Design a protein. Structure first.
Lengths: 80, 139, 729, 142, 75, 225
């Protein structure tokens, strides 16, 4: 499956979490930003790689990246 | 086990396939306050029963799209929908929401996963980890 | 699933994509699972052995088929009137008309006509009978067997070379310069002296009697006593007839210069002295690098010593960078090979070496086009693999502040000035062409902007051409450069001043315009390749491109959209410009030489200054016989070329379907087809092992480019061969 | 004795033969004759058409030099007025709006001052504000 | 009158109005999809003709794809 | 009508059914599909859904229209070509006072229009003489335009074959260049969007092809009496 990595420039804006259509991301308490929350990717085995999370990130470049790796049935989005 | 009356639907050719009976399928359950009509993620419109409704789909993305439609396209907001994964062996795995709290909001008890302690500009050069089985982000 | 064994990520893919990518990444030994450097180098060594054996087998097959089904012994009796034969035709799908049409060149069956120009080569090097060709084919079979066994052998555990052996640059350079180049050239000179020259002078010499036939009347005495001039006395006179003893001299090493009066090719003795001299020079060069005796230079100290106050660190630590990176070496080799192939084409169409090959115009055109296309492909590959090196094997800290890292410091300036020069060429070249077209179309062809190629004509004069009347250097008899008593000058000046050869062809305004267009194409293709190679590491849009590999689809529609952002995509874009530039080059060469051969230089000179003349006098005019290969009234020998012409025009268009339409449409269509198959009775009994999916984005680009390039090459080859064969063949 | 392959159009038989049938470009019937007499000065090839020589010699300075200065002056004018207008706009608290909606007074004022663009350019280069320092320019990651 | 005797006029008129018609048909195919994306409301289209369009569309597309392939081959 | 008419009419049927397939798939699957279950939320005109699911380029209805424009062009080109050649070969011509009819192209349609080589040689190459040899006459404005048609078409391929990331990087370098001289524009230049790139490519493509055909037809028909 693909790998979703989140770096320390996240500001807890939750935009990446809301933009995720397959419910891969989540919010976990943190202490490095004002919101005291950081994104997390506990269910990367369901990610397809649509890059909506990257599209929604407001920080300079991205605090979240998706690297496409091994393709499974879930990752390839196959209904058959 | 899973309990619920299927919504009133005439059926369509965009429904399940052999994967559901061979690999896996998904189920979504929700309590509608009143009977109404909602758009099938597979095409067409279906009338959903008052009370508990249960629906089978082929992909998790379709189930979550239906859940988003339920949450955002009805004045009485449907917040109790649960999405499970159904294996051919009969085992039911509960998927969404993970802990009864929507991921859009922070809830104490979750464990950070996939979080790096460095900026994206501090990743190592490939030449330092070549001939290894890793990637610059993986290290 | 087992295949592919070298990548578990692909092997666990349920879709058919595993079948595709497994082929694509098959020969990428670096990214295989559990790959070490030593295993990488040993596998590459064996694979290179395999490619060498394949080359030898291909040459052996050419020789064998020519000997078996050709007319070599008949062709040597009349090289200017008999078509050489490539191989026989056995097509059960043929009809009576095709059988009658293709029975050509005096054969008794359907047969092809060779255009590789190998009959002339075999005639020139000495072989004259079919048994010699057969013996050569068998010997090449044996050589291929030996190299295959060597590849097997140096793979066994007792013979696998160590990593330190591979990274020995000095010994490799010494052996491959003194031995591979110098000794082979010396052996070729010995072959020419001992066999080729006597055979061309009528005296038959072979394995049976080369031990008792001295190539020169004075054997090894003048050579060893320093009286070398003896070997240059009594050359071949102007009345010499190739392959006979009429007018044949006895000199084995001369400096006649120019061309043979009869074969319109270089004298064989000139080739002998040339290859002998370069053999001596290469043998001297191969004793430069220190290996095991203390003496000799060491590359690292030479590289680290050539610093500079302006470039910073100069060439420091470049030795490690080049030695530890196979992609750097591959790019250097590919660039050098492409330049050398271009040189081969340019110096071989104008300085023919084989007898009676300048009179076979079709083979000359085919050879030029072939080797120029090969050179273009190699030059693209050099930049591609250099970009791969930048992505993978470039260490910024090791190369800190040297030339390699300093290139990336002013890369923006590079791309900016290269864009400016490309735009400057394109604007004012298309403007001149369109101006000439518009003014000619309005019935006033006298207002055309015609610029004389002054500098090129000055260069031609400096080399000795007296047509332009510049009277400079070798064209000036009073100058010192023409009064040095060089043995080649009387022959070279005679050859260049004749208008019967391609040696320094006369030029006009159309040649000026087309050379500047070729310059535009070269600079633009270089712009694409260089920009991709420099931005492969990263850019503003993607600061971390290196973390995403050399070839990746995109970064999604976010950040404004990132279609075609990988370096692989830069190569993909540059391939089209390479093909277009090669098309311009070959069109110019072919039209100019059609005018030269027919003697109607006036047509090209008048009509090449505006694009409508290119469209009408070259494309429309020379397609008359090609498209008439098969007709409602009958079929002639050009039928196969017309069919391949249409075949290329079809594959070229087919490539557009992958190049334009993209993945999602076909993915949804495949969804519908999957549903249809699953719901059909009597068909559900059969199910696919791999879930059918649409081709990936990068795979789609590659497939479209492949169909495009194949159609391009086939169409142009068919048109060129048919036009030249109908006009002159 | 240069251009031995080129001849003056005055004594070129092909040019002379084809010059009596020159088409009239404009409504003036003498345009063909004027073109025929004006093109007799240049050098013609065997095809009868005039050619241009740009080796640098001043005898043929009309072929390339005079038009070269003529074009360069205008191009410098345009570039300088555009650059100066852009720089002046850059400090108006909404440069983009004044980039789409042209400040016609300021635009024409900068237009009328472009004939001194070489002196202005050399003055800017000497003053050091023509070229920015490499440390002050955004650059992509290496 | 005299339109048939003027071959150029015949060819020009035919080709011109043919191209116009083709463009208009493509525009129909476009703005229909625009309507479907924007103005389609499933609530008021329960088990009508449009719903049964959206409910056996896969059979439509599959049979149409087959007929397209068959026509392409056998033509 | 003969064998050639049968083949061409069924070719027309094939092209029309294919164009209908493309446009109907665009309309039917506009709301959603198996690949993308919430397509309608993205809108009518969106470029893609990302490289996920293996790649989701051109899934919107707008992209279906963009793909159907090419097929409509191909079908209408074949239609007008068939009409022109058949009319020239078996209908138009001249009548002698004896009553005999001599057609423009001597009735070669029935024997040549059955092969692709026939279309290439006896229609395109044969009838393009009147437009390529138009220079120096009143018809020259057609010949120029003919070449113009052959140009923009090719030009369009530089939008359809490429993507916007490469152009964005090139614009970054050029912006650095203009920044060095302190002449960078206030309006930041950006490469065309994916949808805009596709639209520009298809527009210039159709323009070039249609202009080519118009010039060819006019120069041919104004020269056959
Ligand atoms: C129905 C059409 C048709 C067919 C089937 C053939 C068939 C043939 N023609 Mg032919 N021909 C045709 C039409 C056709 N022709 C027409 C219209 C003309 C013009 C009049 C000609 C003119 C012509 C000439 C002039 C010659 C032939 C020859 C041949 C033979 C070549 C032998 C061969 O293919 O093995 C070799 C097979 C290959 C080279 C394979 C190439 C294609 C594959 C796809 C490439 C491989 C890709 C990939 C690496 C494959 C992986 C491995 C694979 C097993 C999976 C073959 C019998 C030649 C002949 O008889 O000599 C033997 C010959 O000289 N033909
Ligand atoms: C005298 C000793 C010697 C010799 C003869 C060779 C010879 C060779 N080595 Mg080598 N090698 C040596 C010592 C030697 N090695 C040592 C000491 C080391 C260890 C330091 C190596 C390590 C080494 C490696 C690691 C590899 C080789 C390889 C090769 C082969 C490359 C193919 C090639 O270049 O030929 C073809 C090219 C030529 C003969 C010359 C090039 C053409 C010239 C430049 C221009 C064209 C001339 C002419 C115009 C063209 C002909 C025209 C005609 C057809 C009409 C070649 C056979 C490679 C291989 O795998 O081969 C098995 C390889 O990967 N070598
Ligand atoms: C490089 C390849 C090569 C090879 C294998 C040969 C081989 C041969 N040549 Mg030859 N030759 C060559 C290149 C070559 N030549 C070149 C480039 C020239 C310059 C034109 C000559 C000029 C030449 C002449 C003029 C004669 C030979 C002769 C001979 C034969 C015996 C004399 C000899 O070479 O012993 C050399 C023995 C030595 C002891 C030399 C010393 C060791 C050296 C330095 C190594 C022998 C078959 C002679 C012949 O046919 O039979 C007598 C003869 O008359 N050759
Ligand atoms: C000395 C020659 C040489 C060598 C050793 C390599 C070696 C390599 N290259 Mg390279 N390359 C070369 C020349 C070479 N290249 C040239 C000349 C070009 C310019 C076109 C390229 C362009 C290039 C690119 C763009 C890429 C590589 C990559 C690679 C690496 C792995 C992938 C690969 O090549 O295998 C896999 C190769 C294939 C799957 C090619 C199969 C395609 C076939 C040959 C097309 C055939 C067409 C068809 C049969 C025609 C039929 C005709 C019929 C109808 C008549 C590998 C290190 C890749 C990389 O980065 O990996 C690290 C990569 O992305 N190369
Ligand atoms: C005939 C087709 C064609 C043309 C004209 C161009 C032209 C250009 N390409 Mg392109 N390209 C093409 C096909 C073409 N390409 C194809 C098929 C590919 C493969 C995908 C590429 C791939 C490619 C790449 C990868 C790159 C280019 C680049 C360039 C530019 C380099 C400058 C140059 O060569 O001349 C100068 C330009 C011209 C002569 C074209 C201008 C001509 C017009 C007519 C001028 C007048 C404007 C006109 C009046 C406006 C009227 C508008 C109004 C009617 C609506 C230029 C804009 C490079 C670039 O951006 O360089 C900076 C670059 O990086 N192209
Ligand atoms: C290689 C390229 C090249 C370049 C860059 C030049 C450049 C020049 N040539 Mg030139 N020239 C060349 C090749 C070249 N030449 C060749 C190949 C020939 C042989 C035909 C000549 C023959 C030639 C002659 C006969 C003369 C020049 C002159 C000149 C100068 C003209 C000064 C001018 O107009 O500025 C003036 C700018 C402003 C007033 C502003 C100029 C520096 C002229 C010269 O020497 O002038 C001093 C001159 O009379 N050239
Ligand atoms: C009666 C006819 C008609 C009407 C009223 C509309 C109305 C509308 N269309 Mg529609 N359309 C039509 C026909 C029509 N269309 C046809 C025939 C097609 C097929 C090509 C389309 C394809 C189409 C698409 C694909 C889209 C619309 C959209 C729209 C909406 C407005 C946005 C727009 O296009 O404006 C802006 C208009 C332009 C930017 C056009 C300017 C550029 C054109 C293409 C240049 C044409 C060049 C010209 C032919 C030749 C010049 C040569 C040059 C050298 C001088 C609006 C509801 C858009 C939408 O979704 O809105 C809801 C949209 O995305 N239409
Ligand atoms: C006919 C071809 C004409 C077009 C070809 C390319 C045109 C581009 C030329 C631009 C000049 C590039 C900047 C020079 C690069 C530069 O100035 O580097 C500084 C360099 C001085 O070198 P150093 O002595 O620092 O060291 C040179 C080496 O010994 C190691 O650095 O200058 C030269 O070598 C000039 C020749 C470069 C070639
Ligand atoms: C000042 C200015 C600007 C900026 C200008 C800048 C920054 C310019 C920078 C230039 C640089 C850095 C380099 C320039 C190099 C120029 C060269 C190399 C000129 C070569 C000339 C040759 C080779 C002359 C050739 C022969 C000369 C001779 C006279 C005959 O013909 C024959 C012929 C054609 C051979 C702008 C862009 C901001 C705005 C403009 O309006 C003005
Ligand atoms: C990116 C990269 C890369 C690539 C690049 C390339 C590929 C390049 C190319 C380049 C090229 C491809 C070059 C070329 C060059 C050439 C030259 C430089 C030449 C010169 C010449 C001369 C100088 C000559 C002279 C003369 C004459 C003219 C005459 C008389 C004689 C004489 C000889 C004197 C690499 C991999 C490397 C590395 C990494 C990065
Ligand atoms: C060249 C190119 C660009 C770069 C092109 C750009 C930025 C367009 C530049 C247009 C200039 C500025 C104006 C020319 C067009 C005008 C309509 C001309 C108007 C002329 C009148 C005012 C007289 C892309 O952005 C792109 C994006 C996606 C796929 C392919 C491509 C692509 O091929
Ligand atoms: S969108 Fe970016 S900044 Fe916002 S929560 Fe997600 S990772 Fe953090
Ligand atoms: S290449 Fe395809 S998936 Fe990637 S950004 Fe472009 S349209 Fe979207």
């Amino acid at each position: 499956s693909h790998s979703v990595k989140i770096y320390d420039t996240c500001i807890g804006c939750t935009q990446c979490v809301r933009a995720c259509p397959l419910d891969v991301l989540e919010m976990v308490p943190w202490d490095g930003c004002k919101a005291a929350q950081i994104a997390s990717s506990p269910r990367t085995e369901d990610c397809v790689g649509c890059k909506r999370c990257e599209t929604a990130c407001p920080t300079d470049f991205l605090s979240i990246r998706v690297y496409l790796g091994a393709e499974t049935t879930r990752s390839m989005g196959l209904a058959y | 086990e899973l309990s619920g009356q299927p919504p009133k639907f005439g059926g369509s050719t965009g429904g399940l396939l052999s994967k559901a009976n061979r690999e896996e399928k998904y189920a979504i359950t929700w309590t509608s306050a009143s009977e109404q009509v909602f758009e099938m993620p597979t095409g067409g419109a279906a009338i959903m029963n008052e009370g508990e409704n249960l629906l089978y789909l082929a992909r998790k993305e379709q189930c979550l799209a239906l859940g988003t439609q339920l949450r955002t396209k009805f004045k009485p907001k449907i917040q109790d929908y649960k999405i499970y994964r159904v294996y051919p062996s009969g085992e039911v795995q509960y998927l969404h929401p993970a802990d009864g709290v929507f991921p859009e909001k922070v809830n104490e008890g979750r464990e950070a996963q996939g979080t790096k302690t460095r900026r994206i500009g501090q990743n190592p050069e490939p030449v330092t980890i070549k001939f290894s089985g890793k990637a610059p982000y993986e290290v | 699933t087992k295949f592919p064994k070298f990548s578990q990520d692909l092997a666990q893919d349920p879709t058919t994509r595993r079948i595709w990518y497994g082929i694509a990444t098959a020969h990428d030994f670096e990214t295989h699972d559990g790959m070490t450097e030593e295993n990488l180098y040993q596998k590459i060594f064996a694979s290179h052995f395999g490619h060498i054996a394949i080359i030898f087998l291909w040459t052996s097959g050419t020789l064998f088929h020519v000997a078996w089904q050709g007319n070599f012994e008949q062709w040597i009796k009349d090289p200017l009137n008999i078509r050489p034969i490539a191989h026989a035709i056995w097509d059960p799908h043929f009809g009576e008309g095709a059988v009658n049409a293709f029975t050509q060149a005096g054969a008794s069956n359907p047969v092809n006509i060779a255009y590789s120009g190998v009959y002339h080569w075999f005639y020139t090097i000495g072989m004259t009978t079919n048994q010699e060709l057969y013996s050569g084919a068998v010997f090449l079979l044996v050589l291929a067997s030996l190299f295959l066994f060597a590849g097997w052998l140096h793979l066994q555990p007792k013979f696998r070379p160590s990593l330190a052996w591979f990274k020995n640059a000095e010994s490799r350079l010494n052996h491959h310069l003194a031995g591979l180049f110098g000794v082979s050239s010396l052996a070729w000179a010995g072959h020419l002296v001992h066999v080729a020259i006597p055979e061309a002078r009528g005296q038959h010499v072979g394995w049976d009697n080369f031990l008792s036939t001295p190539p020169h009347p004075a054997g090894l005495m003048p050579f060893f006593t320093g009286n070398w001039g003896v070997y240059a006395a009594d050359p071949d006179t102007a009345g010499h007839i190739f392959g006979t003893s009429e007018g044949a001299g006895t000199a084995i090493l001369t400096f006649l210069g120019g061309f043979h009066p009869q074969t319109e090719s270089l004298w064989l003795t000139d080739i002998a002295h040339h290859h002998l001299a370069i053999a001596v020079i290469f043998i001297i060069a191969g004793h430069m690098y220190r290996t095991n005796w203390g003496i000799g230079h060491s590359i690292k100290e030479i590289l680290n010593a050539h610093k500079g106050p302006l470039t910073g660190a100069g060439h420091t630590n470049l030795y490690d960078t080049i030695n530890n990176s196979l992609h750097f070496q591959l790019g250097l080799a590919l660039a050098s090979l492409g330049v050398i192939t271009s040189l081969v084409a340019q110096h071989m169409y104008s300085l023919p070496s084989y007898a009676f090959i300048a009179q076979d115009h079709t083979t000359q055109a085919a050879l030029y086009t072939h080797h120029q296309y090969i050179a273009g492909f190699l030059m693209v590959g050099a930049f591609a693999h250099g970009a791969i090196f930048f992505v993978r094997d470039y260490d910024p800290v090791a190369n800190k502040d040297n030339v390699l890292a300093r290139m990336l410091e002013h890369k923006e300036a590079l791309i900016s000035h290269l864009s400016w020069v490309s735009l400057f060429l394109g604007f004012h070249t298309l403007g001149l062409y369109v101006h000439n077209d518009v003014v000619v179309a309005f019935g006033t062809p006298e207002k055309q902007i015609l610029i004389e190629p002054v500098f090129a004509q000055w260069i031609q004069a400096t080399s000795g051409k007296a047509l332009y009347g510049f009277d400079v250097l070798l064209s000036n008899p009073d100058s010192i450069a023409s009064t040095t008593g060089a043995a080649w000058l009387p022959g070279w000046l005679d050859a260049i001043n004749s208008g019967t050869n391609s040696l320094f062809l006369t030029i006009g305004p159309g040649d000026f315009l087309v050379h500047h267009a070729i310059a535009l194409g070269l600079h633009t293709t270089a712009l694409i390749l260089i920009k991709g190679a420099l931005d492969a590491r990263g850019s503003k849009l993607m600061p971390d491109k290196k973390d995403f590999g050399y070839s990746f689809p995109c970064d999604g529609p976010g950040r404004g959209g990132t279609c075609d952002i990988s370096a692989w995509d830069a190569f993909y874009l540059a391939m089209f410009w390479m093909l277009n530039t090669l098309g311009w080059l070959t069109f110019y060469w072919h039209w100019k030489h059609l005018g030269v051969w027919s003697g109607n230089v006036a047509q090209f000179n008048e009509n090449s200054t505006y694009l409508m003349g290119w469209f009408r006098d070259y494309l429309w005019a020379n397609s008359a016989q090609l498209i008439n290969g098969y007709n409602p009234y009958g079929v002639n020998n050009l039928s196969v070329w017309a069919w391949m012409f249409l075949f290329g025009h079809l594959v070229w268009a087919t490539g557009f379907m992958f190049l334009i339409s993209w993945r999602g449409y076909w993915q949804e269509l495949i969804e519908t087809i999957v549903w249809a198959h699953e719901r059909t009775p009597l068909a559900n009994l059969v199910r696919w092992k791999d879930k059918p999916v649409a081709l990936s984005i990068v795979q789609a680009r590659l497939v479209g480019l492949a169909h495009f390039t194949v159609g391009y090459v086939l169409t142009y080859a068919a048109f060129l061969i048919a036009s030249t064969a109908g006009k002159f063949g | 004795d240069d251009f031995a392959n080129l001849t003056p159009c005055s004594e070129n038989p092909a040019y002379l033969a084809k010059s009596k049938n020159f088409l009239n470009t404009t409504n003036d019937p003498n345009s063909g004759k004027i073109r025929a007499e004006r093109y007799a000065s240049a050098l013609c090839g065997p095809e009868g058409y005039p050619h241009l020589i740009v080796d640098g010699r001043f005898t043929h300075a009309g072929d390339f030099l005079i038009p070269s200065i003529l074009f360069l002056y205008i191009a410098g004018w345009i570039g300088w007025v555009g650059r100066s207008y852009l720089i002046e706009i850059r400090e108006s608290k909404n440069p983009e709006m004044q980039e789409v909606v042209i400040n016609v007074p300021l635009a024409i004022k900068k237009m009328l001052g472009g004939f001194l663009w070489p002196l202005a350019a050399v003055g800017e280069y000497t003053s050091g504000k023509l070229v920015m320092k490499d440390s002050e320019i955004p650059t992509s990651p290496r | 009158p005299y339109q048939a005797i003027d071959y150029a006029t015949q060819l020009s008129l035919f080709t011109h109005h043919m191209w116009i018609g083709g463009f208009l048909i493509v525009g129909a195919g476009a703005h229909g999809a625009i309507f479907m994306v924007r103005d389609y409301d499933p609530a008021k289209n329960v088990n009508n003709l449009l719903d049964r369009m959206l409910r056996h569309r896969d059979a439509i597309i599959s049979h149409l794809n087959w007929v397209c392939i068959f026509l392409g081959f056998h033509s | 009508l003969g064998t050639a008419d049968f083949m061409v009419h069924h070719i027309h049927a094939f092209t029309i059914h294919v164009t209908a397939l493309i446009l109907l798939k665009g309309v039917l699957y506009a709301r959603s599909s198996r690949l993308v279950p919430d397509k309608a939320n993205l809108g009518f005109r969106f470029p893609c859904d990302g490289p996920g699911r293996g790649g989701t380029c051109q899934v919107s209805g707008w992209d279906h229209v963009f793909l159907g424009l090419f097929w409509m062009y191909n079908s209408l080109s074949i239609v007008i070509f068939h009409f022109s050649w058949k009319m020239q070969s078996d209908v138009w011509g001249t009548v002698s006072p004896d009553g005999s009819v001599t057609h423009v192209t001597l009735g070669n349609f029935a024997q040549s229009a059955i092969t692709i080589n026939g279309w290439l040689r006896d229609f395109l190459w044969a009838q393009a003489a009147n437009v390529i040899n138009s220079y120096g006459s009143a018809l020259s404005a057609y010949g120029i335009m003919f070449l113009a048609g052959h140009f923009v078409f090719a030009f369009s391929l530089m939008f359809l074959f490429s993507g916007r990331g490469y152009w964005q990087e090139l614009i970054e370098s050029i912006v650095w260049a203009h920044n060095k001289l302190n002449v960078a524009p206030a309006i930041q230049p950006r490469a065309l969007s994916i949808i805009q790139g596709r639209a520009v490519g298809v527009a210039h493509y159709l323009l070039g092809g249609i202009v080519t055909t118009w010039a060819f037809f006019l120069a041919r028909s104004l020269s056959i009496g």
